[PDB]
């Protein structure tokens, strides 16, 4: 029911995952700023920038991550950004906002120059994870797993990443067997939500593509992380 070595790993991850927060200045904007498309997009840029800042801080602390080759570190970070962000933004939409602010945040996302074709599956993802009442444990481990995926483009040592990833998958699996024994399929279904996460790489690329036609601007970190040049 978790070896002591698995307990340690779980505590390292949760410790690291929890010292990341959405700054108050940004959530305040969700209520206070006017509801124009220009201001909506500006706020999303700030959330995005913050998601990526938070991704990096989480990543740099992942066990074994310093031991990987420097180029691969960067391929992981960039490979994973979209999937990790959408997941985080799901936790935030479901769980780290006061009751009414989902509705407003949603209203802003709905009037920021994103096609319904990307919105529909986004909010369908948010819905489906909320109904699962996904735990903090789950968000955290799932996030670590996405980041340490051996399947990204340009990894020179896929085996070294696989050795960091496997232990995380075993922990999560055992947590499922433990905390949800009446649902033996739970682990598979969380892996199914990872499969659906992978869908957003395509969507996001399309979304960035449409914003760029209307000459919207993005920040240094964001242009860098997604090769927007």
């Amino acid at each position: 029911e978790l070896t002591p070595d698995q307990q340690t790993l779980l505590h390292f991850i949760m410790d690291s995952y929890n010292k990341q927060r959405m700054p108050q200045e940004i959530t305040n904007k969700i209520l206070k700023e006017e509801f124009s498309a220009e201001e909506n997009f500006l706020i999303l840029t700030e959330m995005a920038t913050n998601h990526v800042q938070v991704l990096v801080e989480f990543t740099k602390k992942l066990p074994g991550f310093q031991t990987l080759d420097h180029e691969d570190q960067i391929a992981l970070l960039k490979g994973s950004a979209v999937e990790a962000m959408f997941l985080r933004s799901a936790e935030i939409f479901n769980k780290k906002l006061p009751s009414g602010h989902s509705d407003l945040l949603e209203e802003r996302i709905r009037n920021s120059g994103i096609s319904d074709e990307y919105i529909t599956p986004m909010f369908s993802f948010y819905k489906s994870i909320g109904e699962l009442k996904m735990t903090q444990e789950e968000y955290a481990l799932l996030t670590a797993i996405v980041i340490l995926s051996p399947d990204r483009q340009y990894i020179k040592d896929r085996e070294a990443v696989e050795k960091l990833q496997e232990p995380l998958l075993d922990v999560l699996q055992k947590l499922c067997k433990i905390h949800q024994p009446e649902n033996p399929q739970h682990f598979a279904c969380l892996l199914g939500r990872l499969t659906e996460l992978r869908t957003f790489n395509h969507h996001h690329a399309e979304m960035l593509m449409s914003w760029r036609v209307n000459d919207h601007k993005f920040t240094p970190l964001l242009c860098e992380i997604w090769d927007v040049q």
Binding site: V56, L221, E224
Partner: peptide, 10 residues
């Protein structure tokens, strides 16, 4: 990738 490297090391 000088910016991402910087953020990885600091």
């Amino acid at each position: 990738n000088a910016l991402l490297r910087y953020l990885l090391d600091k």
